[PDB]
């Protein structure tokens, strides 16, 4: 019925390790880039 | 012209059993300027002595105990002299300009200073509220406010951050105390060095000073200068927006060497590159500094300036412009753009120009005699001696095209800048962004 059955789940296997490598990589770009936001601090000073 | 340079007198320095440094520059001119120049400022200051290097200044005028005040400014008047001075972040100054035939006099009257102030608790008090106004003053010159707000963030943290100025709760709060233990702490000989230029005959000079300069440095601790505490550089911003106001201004910079790094030449033959524009100028024809060009043909800019402002061990490399609320992007990104040309593909016909620019203001530098004594002033405090135009010459009359690149790239390349924006900023980007306008995608 499905004769790719292995090459699909060896296949699956390497995906999954990618999701885990990949996924974090991005996840740390993401947070490297918006820590400039996260970081931030605003304050209102008028003159009085 | 190099013979000119050569046949320039050579600058005369000795120092004192005491500590203070005497050296000047000798001319035929009548008149001339002598100053001591104290390694003081507010980087010295601390979090609740911060503002007094200042509330300084503003007493070291009106008199001394010897003579009070309607005599010292009626001796100075009286004379023809012009006492007039400063205090930076690590550098503050009193400087005299007579007919150098009160060389003598002068040198006294800077002593009774630098030594003796009335600190009349009756003057500060006034003091007081001046500076509280005329800092309300320096507030709406955009054009500095930026420039302390760069500090404050360039350094965050550390003792540069502070400006020079001091925050208002201080200047209404510092003590008749705090000011003499500012005074007594800081003004030392060691730390002060005594620079004139004009018609002087150095010894006379040192006689003098040897004479009124009657210090004398019993501990090993008198006779040391201490060294500064090393300050943070943090690649951030800060901005306090504000469409209120005309315009933005915006200034952004990368740590600088510090006055000793030899670099610093390249590094200034740099900024000659690129230079600075003024709508008022002539010359959307300018020379290679296409920031001028491009912030011509498309109105950029009012006008932008780079500077390499350094001290002891630190500095800010960077440039600062002003423009309509709705130009600021295009303006930057053309900039910061030309700090990437610059440092990835910058071409000898360039440099060569370059040079002969800053040799122009090399020597224009030194334009006078009060000027000359800010030199040797600056010179010896900062640099340890004196640096002659005939070698500040070969310094930059050396930097090739590919020394600049060198250089910039390894102060600007993939650096993280600091950058203030006060104004109707809003169309300036947010950091990642001129971050990444650091690395060229060559």
């Given at each position: ?48 | ?273 690129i230079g600075h524009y003024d709508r008022t100028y002539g010359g959307g024809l300018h020379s290679s ?144 962004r001129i971050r990444s306008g650091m690395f060229w995608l060559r």
């Amino acid at each position: 019925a499905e004769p790719e059955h292995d090459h699909r789940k060896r296949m699956g296997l390497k995906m999954l390790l990618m999701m885990g490598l990949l996924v974090p990589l991005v996840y740390y770009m993401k947070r490297h880039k918006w820590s400039v936001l996260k970081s931030r601090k605003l304050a209102y000073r008028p003159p009085k | 012209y190099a013979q000119a340079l050569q046949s320039v007198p050579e600058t005369q320095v000795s120092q004192l059993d005491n500590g203070v440094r005497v050296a000047s520059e000798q001319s035929s001119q009548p008149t001339c300027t002598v100053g001591v120049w104290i390694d003081a400022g507010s980087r010295y200051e601390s979090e609740k002595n911060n503002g007094a290097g200042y509330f300084l200044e503003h007493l070291a005028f009106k008199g001394t105990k010897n003579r009070p005040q309607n005599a010292l400014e009626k001796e100075v008047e009286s004379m023809g002299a012009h006492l007039n001075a400063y205090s930076s972040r690590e550098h503050t100054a009193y400087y005299i300009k007579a007919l150098s035939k009160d060389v003598p006099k002068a040198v006294e009257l800077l002593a009774d200073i630098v030594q003796n102030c009335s600190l009349e608790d009756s003057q500060i008090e006034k003091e007081r509220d001046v500076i509280v106004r005329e800092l309300q003053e320096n507030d709406t010159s955009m054009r500095e406010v930026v420039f302390n707000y760069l500090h404050a963030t360039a350094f965050q943290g550390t003792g540069l951050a502070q400006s020079v100025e001091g925050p208002s709760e201080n200047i209404r709060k510092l003590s008749r105390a705090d000011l003499t233990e500012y005074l007594s702490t800081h003004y030392t000989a060691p730390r002060m060095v005594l620079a004139a230029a004009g018609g002087v005959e150095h010894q006379q000079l040192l006689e003098l000073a040897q004479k009124h300069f009657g210090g004398v440095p019993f501990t090993y601790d008198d006779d040391a200068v201490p060294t500064l505490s090393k300050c943070r550089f943090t690649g951030s911003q800060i901005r306090h927006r504000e469409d209120g106001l005309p315009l933005a201004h915006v200034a952004i910079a990368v740590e600088g060497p510090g006055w000793a790094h030899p670099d610093l030449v390249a590094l200034q033959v740099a900024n000659a590159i690129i230079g600075h524009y003024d709508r008022t100028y002539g010359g959307g024809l300018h020379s290679s500094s296409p920031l001028a060009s491009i912030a011509v043909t498309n109105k950029l800019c009012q006008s932008f300036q780079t500077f390499s402002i350094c001290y002891s061990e630190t500095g800010l490399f960077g440039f600062y412009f002003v423009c309509d609320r709705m130009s600021i992007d295009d303006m930057m990104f053309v900039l910061q753009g030309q700090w990437m040309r610059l440092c990835t593909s910058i071409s000898e016909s360039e440099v060569l120009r370059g040079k002969n620019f800053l040799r122009n203001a090399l020597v224009s530098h030194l334009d006078g005699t009060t000027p000359v004594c800010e030199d040797i002033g600056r010179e010896l405090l900062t640099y340890g001696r004196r640096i002659p135009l005939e070698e500040w010459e070969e310094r930059l009359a050396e930097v090739d095209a590919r020394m600049v690149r060198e250089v910039c790239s390894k102060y600007i390349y993939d650096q993280c800048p600091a950058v203030a924006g006060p104004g109707p900023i809003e169309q300036l980007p947010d950091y990642n962004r001129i971050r990444s306008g650091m690395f060229w995608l060559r």
